[PDB]
């Protein structure tokens, strides 16, 4: 019995009919579904020991604080951070990138300083750095794609110079499904004194991530993509860097002392956590980490490689389909998603008919990567994305339904 | 059957023993407990229709989006906002104040411009304005207290001048339990062209709040204090004002278009909601609003006035107790909390012993109001804070336990 067939039971939401058909959920890149263990953790928090954290003294507050801080350690261990104090809790990866942009970027970047991104970057990795650029006079250098539709790594390399102060790029693309060799990139960046921010939203849920191995300076991720609740994510940052950084959000809990004329600030990570945090959600994220760890991230990744390949092979066998990004092989890895279009058909029509007539859930749009879609010559793409609760059966159902959907719209032509 | 005795059943957490004693929770000003209705909403979201929101098409996504936006309307209705688009979702009131500080403050405050606050302000007010002052040359003006330990309204009004750009003050104080005449203050501020930001963290959970009546420009609150989940809060802002303000956090969803060289931004509230929001938590906050509305905010306020008065009377009857803030009267209304100290005893000792020996949960510290405590001549106070699930029996138990605790520490003297 495959991994997907073994774990499906844990995810209550998968066992329903939508629009008359068995639900087939293929939108995990937009957000993931939650196992009972995580939901249980969340309910247990609110039912039994909810109270505000830090400075609290009383039994419930002490327990809430202990569990909140243990969750921070769980996340630390998940990505192999050396110290749990290098983990900062935010609402999502987006806010975590903004934290870096405001706190680190506004205080380190000077006119002429260069920040390197790729054209495949998610909006949350583009927009904050545009804003910093506008404020500091720093300039964004974009890495275009090669013929295999992956960021041109040769074109990344010679972009790195003594003027480069930051590289901010995906670990795995949410559209192309391709990866970047972060570890090498970090070496090249450090060689000129530049820092590296890793947008790890599509790697943290799906494969082993070791921030000490990568040696990345910053790393970001969202709970909602990794079986955890919405409303929380995190910033990993090297202790020495966090310590060098000024506060972003101000208020309760992040101060040491407050006087009328000025305040002094706590050390990281508290320095960066203003006011009452998402306590229950942090605890449930910890439960999500325990859940994924229990299955095992190597196991999840090997399973995803298999179903990902299966999806790619079956999808690409349909005529008139183009799948964006690299071909899978011995050397080139793909995440378990495919972004695609079908000749003469609008992906929104595909997604709508798939949902309404077949109960298949995919997404249509630019997937927060508008310049990428621009570069590839389209305004939108259809995207089917998998997680470890999906099965080859799901892929088979998708392919049958997609073939039907294409047949339907082509019948009027 | 009193309100507290009728609703206690809804709150699973109150029915336990801690340290061998029945729990008596008197720390609702730090955070509130959650009724089953709210927890059910949260669980139902994750089990049945979790999916990312906006741009989604498929059945679960449509439902999640409908419920997420319906929750925004529930909040807008709760505070009588004229338009649901005047509600912006944040992590907490602290972030909402920071949004105003960064987006409105940095773009509108010039050297010499003044911002008025009181010495009783929460840190999440004080710190963001301090930082804005440091960046813009603006100057903070603090309102001191009068003989009745309430911010001196005469001094407040006299500070209002052509140089006043913002008044940022609490509706109700989280320490003093006193309120400010916000509607009146708004009139004086608008007459010199200043804006008013209302820190409504301690009013929204406890009394009818009507932003059109107050006519305030900004208002903030946190979900966790009003029977809702941690991880979400909101900014209310006049539509015209929100439209004039630049983006704070950047990334997905808050954009209209993204190009390599620049981005255009959505209109409010989307403009200020970057990346995947706390979807489940917003929906549960809507359930909290429904739950409070079902009881009735007038019933709640009337009940709190009764038990607040009872607590004040019983507490002030104990020798050597000093309660901070104004005395109850028909003129002066207090929120249902008391911050206090006992002659010669440290409040941390009182809180620790109350918890360990009596299962009574209160808080000791500066309650994020360190300048207020400094003003009053202490570093910390004990605080007992009630909500509508507390009863006169709870107050009785507190008073019995407090007298014991005082007796214990004074026995070594």
Short mmCIF file of C-alpha atoms in Angstrom, two decimals, chain A residues 42-329:
data_model
loop_
_atom_site.label_atom_id
_atom_site.label_comp_id
_atom_site.label_asym_id
_atom_site.label_seq_id
_atom_site.Cartn_x
_atom_site.Cartn_y
_atom_site.Cartn_z
CA UNK A 42 -4.97 22.97 17.82
CA UNK A 43 -8.17 21.97 19.63
CA UNK A 44 -6.26 20.66 22.62
CA UNK A 45 -4.50 24.02 22.97
CA UNK A 46 -7.71 26.05 22.99
CA UNK A 47 -9.65 23.60 25.14
CA UNK A 48 -7.04 22.95 27.81
CA UNK A 49 -4.23 25.45 28.12
CA UNK A 50 -4.80 28.66 26.14
CA UNK A 51 -3.27 31.69 27.90
CA UNK A 52 -0.91 34.45 26.87
CA UNK A 53 2.77 33.54 26.74
CA UNK A 54 5.90 34.84 28.54
CA UNK A 55 5.91 36.63 31.95
CA UNK A 56 2.69 34.79 32.84
CA UNK A 57 3.42 32.81 36.04
CA UNK A 58 0.13 30.86 36.32
CA UNK A 59 -0.27 27.19 35.39
CA UNK A 60 -2.01 27.63 32.02
CA UNK A 61 0.32 30.46 30.98
CA UNK A 62 3.38 28.42 31.93
CA UNK A 63 2.15 25.47 29.85
CA UNK A 64 1.20 27.64 26.90
CA UNK A 65 4.66 29.26 27.00
CA UNK A 66 6.44 25.92 27.27
CA UNK A 67 4.56 24.50 24.29
CA UNK A 68 4.96 27.66 22.21
CA UNK A 69 8.73 27.65 22.73
CA UNK A 70 8.96 23.89 22.19
CA UNK A 71 7.26 24.44 18.81
CA UNK A 72 10.01 26.96 17.92
CA UNK A 73 12.56 24.24 18.74
CA UNK A 74 10.66 21.73 16.64
CA UNK A 75 10.88 24.05 13.62
CA UNK A 76 14.56 24.69 14.37
CA UNK A 77 15.31 20.97 14.38
CA UNK A 78 13.23 20.39 11.24
CA UNK A 79 15.48 22.62 9.13
CA UNK A 80 18.62 21.89 11.17
CA UNK A 81 19.03 25.40 12.56
CA UNK A 82 21.90 25.40 15.09
CA UNK A 83 19.85 27.38 17.60
CA UNK A 84 16.11 27.73 18.14
CA UNK A 85 16.68 31.45 18.66
CA UNK A 86 17.31 31.70 14.90
CA UNK A 87 13.60 30.99 14.25
CA UNK A 88 11.23 34.01 14.07
CA UNK A 89 7.43 33.52 13.85
CA UNK A 90 5.49 35.51 11.25
CA UNK A 91 2.03 35.23 9.60
CA UNK A 92 3.50 33.66 6.47
CA UNK A 93 6.62 33.43 4.37
CA UNK A 94 5.59 36.70 2.73
CA UNK A 95 5.81 38.66 5.97
CA UNK A 96 9.12 36.91 6.73
CA UNK A 97 10.63 38.23 3.45
CA UNK A 98 9.29 41.70 4.27
CA UNK A 99 10.95 41.45 7.69
CA UNK A 100 14.29 40.90 5.97
CA UNK A 101 13.62 43.65 3.43
CA UNK A 102 12.74 46.30 6.01
CA UNK A 103 15.08 45.33 8.84
CA UNK A 104 18.11 44.06 6.93
CA UNK A 105 17.60 45.65 3.51
CA UNK A 106 16.80 49.24 4.48
CA UNK A 107 19.79 49.27 6.86
CA UNK A 108 22.41 47.59 4.62
CA UNK A 109 21.71 48.47 0.96
CA UNK A 110 23.25 51.59 -0.59
CA UNK A 111 22.82 53.20 -4.03
CA UNK A 112 24.29 50.91 -6.68
CA UNK A 113 24.13 47.81 -4.49
CA UNK A 114 22.74 44.88 -6.43
CA UNK A 115 20.14 42.28 -5.46
CA UNK A 116 19.85 39.16 -7.61
CA UNK A 117 16.52 37.43 -8.27
CA UNK A 118 15.31 35.21 -11.10
CA UNK A 119 12.43 35.84 -13.50
CA UNK A 120 10.71 32.82 -11.91
CA UNK A 121 10.43 34.51 -8.54
CA UNK A 122 7.17 34.50 -6.57
CA UNK A 123 5.62 37.99 -6.04
CA UNK A 124 6.47 37.87 -2.34
CA UNK A 125 10.12 37.62 -3.28
CA UNK A 126 9.86 40.37 -5.93
CA UNK A 127 7.64 43.14 -4.58
CA UNK A 128 9.41 43.71 -1.20
CA UNK A 129 12.77 44.00 -2.99
CA UNK A 130 11.36 46.40 -5.56
CA UNK A 131 10.19 48.57 -2.65
CA UNK A 132 13.58 48.44 -0.92
CA UNK A 133 15.20 49.24 -4.29
CA UNK A 134 13.01 52.32 -4.67
CA UNK A 135 13.94 53.44 -1.17
CA UNK A 136 17.69 52.78 -1.19
CA UNK A 137 18.72 53.20 -4.82
CA UNK A 138 19.70 49.52 -4.92
CA UNK A 139 19.18 47.76 -8.26
CA UNK A 140 17.50 44.44 -9.02
CA UNK A 141 19.32 42.10 -11.40
CA UNK A 142 17.08 39.44 -12.93
CA UNK A 143 18.29 36.02 -14.04
CA UNK A 144 16.47 34.80 -17.16
CA UNK A 145 15.75 31.20 -18.16
CA UNK A 146 17.71 28.77 -20.29
CA UNK A 147 16.34 26.57 -23.09
CA UNK A 148 15.27 23.92 -20.54
CA UNK A 149 13.13 26.57 -18.80
CA UNK A 150 15.22 26.76 -15.61
CA UNK A 151 17.01 29.88 -14.29
CA UNK A 152 20.27 30.14 -16.23
CA UNK A 153 22.80 29.30 -13.52
CA UNK A 154 25.69 30.42 -15.73
CA UNK A 155 23.82 33.72 -16.00
CA UNK A 156 23.43 33.83 -12.21
CA UNK A 157 27.17 33.29 -11.63
CA UNK A 158 28.68 36.16 -13.62
CA UNK A 159 25.98 38.42 -12.24
CA UNK A 160 27.64 37.95 -8.86
CA UNK A 161 30.26 40.66 -8.31
CA UNK A 162 31.64 42.75 -5.43
CA UNK A 163 28.55 44.96 -5.99
CA UNK A 164 26.22 42.08 -5.15
CA UNK A 165 24.95 42.33 -1.58
CA UNK A 166 22.06 39.87 -1.74
CA UNK A 167 20.77 36.91 -3.65
CA UNK A 168 17.07 36.19 -3.02
CA UNK A 169 15.79 33.13 -4.84
CA UNK A 170 13.52 30.09 -4.58
CA UNK A 171 14.79 26.73 -3.45
CA UNK A 172 12.07 25.19 -5.66
CA UNK A 173 9.88 27.03 -8.18
CA UNK A 174 6.13 27.02 -7.53
CA UNK A 175 5.46 27.06 -11.30
CA UNK A 176 8.44 25.46 -13.06
CA UNK A 177 8.94 22.84 -10.31
CA UNK A 178 12.70 23.12 -10.86
CA UNK A 179 15.29 23.62 -8.12
CA UNK A 180 18.31 25.86 -7.73
CA UNK A 181 21.66 24.62 -6.39
CA UNK A 182 21.42 26.83 -3.31
CA UNK A 183 24.56 25.45 -1.66
CA UNK A 184 26.80 26.43 -4.58
CA UNK A 185 25.05 29.78 -4.96
CA UNK A 186 25.67 30.53 -1.29
CA UNK A 187 29.41 29.84 -1.76
CA UNK A 188 29.62 32.21 -4.74
CA UNK A 189 27.64 34.85 -2.85
CA UNK A 190 29.74 34.62 0.32
CA UNK A 191 32.87 34.93 -1.83
CA UNK A 192 31.89 38.55 -2.54
CA UNK A 193 30.31 39.30 0.83
CA UNK A 194 26.71 39.01 -0.37
CA UNK A 195 24.00 37.40 1.75
CA UNK A 196 21.54 34.76 0.49
CA UNK A 197 17.83 34.66 1.26
CA UNK A 198 16.23 31.33 0.38
CA UNK A 199 12.56 31.25 -0.49
CA UNK A 200 12.00 27.69 0.73
CA UNK A 201 8.19 27.60 0.57
CA UNK A 202 8.19 24.70 -1.90
CA UNK A 203 11.09 22.73 -0.41
CA UNK A 204 10.39 22.75 3.34
CA UNK A 205 7.07 20.87 2.90
CA UNK A 206 8.50 18.36 0.44
CA UNK A 207 12.15 17.42 1.03
CA UNK A 208 14.86 17.46 3.70
CA UNK A 209 16.07 21.02 4.26
CA UNK A 210 19.36 21.58 6.15
CA UNK A 211 20.10 25.28 6.62
CA UNK A 212 23.56 24.54 7.99
CA UNK A 213 24.38 22.44 4.93
CA UNK A 214 23.08 25.19 2.64
CA UNK A 215 24.78 27.79 4.82
CA UNK A 216 22.00 30.19 3.80
CA UNK A 217 21.79 33.48 5.68
CA UNK A 218 18.01 33.74 5.62
CA UNK A 219 15.35 31.11 4.87
CA UNK A 220 11.57 31.49 4.70
CA UNK A 221 8.52 29.16 4.75
CA UNK A 222 4.76 29.07 5.45
CA UNK A 223 2.90 26.70 7.73
CA UNK A 224 -0.14 26.42 5.46
CA UNK A 225 1.82 24.59 2.77
CA UNK A 226 3.28 22.00 5.17
CA UNK A 227 0.18 20.52 6.85
CA UNK A 228 0.03 23.32 9.42
CA UNK A 229 -2.57 25.98 10.17
CA UNK A 230 -2.93 29.18 8.26
CA UNK A 231 -1.76 32.32 10.05
CA UNK A 232 1.80 31.30 10.77
CA UNK A 233 5.15 30.98 8.99
CA UNK A 234 8.77 31.63 9.88
CA UNK A 235 12.02 33.39 9.13
CA UNK A 236 15.22 31.52 9.74
CA UNK A 237 18.26 33.79 10.03
CA UNK A 238 21.84 33.31 11.21
CA UNK A 239 22.08 34.43 14.85
CA UNK A 240 24.86 36.94 14.12
CA UNK A 241 22.72 38.52 11.41
CA UNK A 242 19.54 38.63 13.46
CA UNK A 243 21.52 40.25 16.24
CA UNK A 244 22.77 42.91 13.83
CA UNK A 245 19.24 43.70 12.66
CA UNK A 246 16.98 46.49 14.03
CA UNK A 247 13.31 45.91 14.93
CA UNK A 248 10.68 45.71 12.25
CA UNK A 249 7.36 45.71 14.13
CA UNK A 250 7.27 47.54 17.44
CA UNK A 251 5.30 47.04 20.62
CA UNK A 252 4.68 44.61 23.42
CA UNK A 253 7.00 41.71 24.09
CA UNK A 254 9.76 42.82 21.70
CA UNK A 255 11.07 45.48 24.12
CA UNK A 256 13.31 45.20 27.16
CA UNK A 257 12.32 48.51 28.71
CA UNK A 258 9.99 51.26 27.54
CA UNK A 259 10.47 54.86 28.65
CA UNK A 260 8.48 57.87 27.43
CA UNK A 261 11.44 59.16 25.41
CA UNK A 262 12.74 55.85 24.01
CA UNK A 263 12.66 52.06 24.33
CA UNK A 264 15.33 49.38 24.36
CA UNK A 265 14.85 46.11 22.54
CA UNK A 266 15.07 42.44 23.36
CA UNK A 267 17.51 40.14 21.56
CA UNK A 268 16.39 37.82 18.73
CA UNK A 269 14.01 36.21 18.15
CA UNK A 270 11.89 38.17 20.62
CA UNK A 271 13.10 41.44 19.08
CA UNK A 272 11.11 40.55 15.99
CA UNK A 273 7.91 39.21 17.58
CA UNK A 274 5.66 42.16 18.44
CA UNK A 275 2.56 41.64 20.56
CA UNK A 276 0.62 38.48 21.22
CA UNK A 277 1.76 35.83 18.76
CA UNK A 278 -0.24 33.17 16.94
CA UNK A 279 0.18 30.84 19.97
CA UNK A 280 -2.24 28.06 19.09
CA UNK A 281 -1.14 28.12 15.48
CA UNK A 282 2.54 27.90 16.42
CA UNK A 283 1.78 24.87 18.58
CA UNK A 284 -0.14 23.22 15.71
CA UNK A 285 2.76 23.97 13.33
CA UNK A 286 4.93 22.07 15.78
CA UNK A 287 2.47 19.21 15.50
CA UNK A 288 2.70 19.44 11.72
CA UNK A 289 6.48 19.14 11.97
CA UNK A 290 6.10 16.06 14.22
CA UNK A 291 3.63 14.54 11.75
CA UNK A 292 5.91 15.08 8.72
CA UNK A 293 8.92 13.89 10.72
CA UNK A 294 7.04 10.74 11.74
CA UNK A 295 6.40 9.81 8.13
CA UNK A 296 9.94 10.91 7.34
CA UNK A 297 11.03 13.61 4.91
CA UNK A 298 13.27 11.30 2.84
CA UNK A 299 10.24 9.00 2.46
CA UNK A 300 7.95 11.91 1.48
CA UNK A 301 10.49 13.15 -1.09
CA UNK A 302 11.08 9.75 -2.69
CA UNK A 303 7.31 9.28 -2.93
CA UNK A 304 6.85 12.73 -4.47
CA UNK A 305 9.59 12.04 -7.02
CA UNK A 306 7.64 8.97 -8.16
CA UNK A 307 4.16 10.51 -8.36
CA UNK A 308 5.65 13.69 -9.80
CA UNK A 309 7.30 11.76 -12.62
CA UNK A 310 4.05 9.86 -13.14
CA UNK A 311 2.06 13.10 -13.42
CA UNK A 312 4.63 14.59 -15.80
CA UNK A 313 4.71 11.52 -18.04
CA UNK A 314 0.94 11.12 -18.27
CA UNK A 315 0.24 14.81 -18.70
CA UNK A 316 2.88 15.17 -21.43
CA UNK A 317 1.46 12.20 -23.34
CA UNK A 318 -1.70 14.18 -24.09
CA UNK A 319 -1.49 15.97 -27.43
CA UNK A 320 -1.55 19.79 -27.40
CA UNK A 321 -0.20 19.91 -23.84
CA UNK A 322 2.86 21.99 -22.99
CA UNK A 323 4.32 21.65 -19.50
CA UNK A 324 6.51 24.54 -18.41
CA UNK A 325 9.95 23.91 -16.92
CA UNK A 326 12.61 21.16 -17.23
CA UNK A 327 12.22 17.52 -18.27
CA UNK A 328 12.69 15.11 -15.36
CA UNK A 329 15.72 12.81 -15.53
#
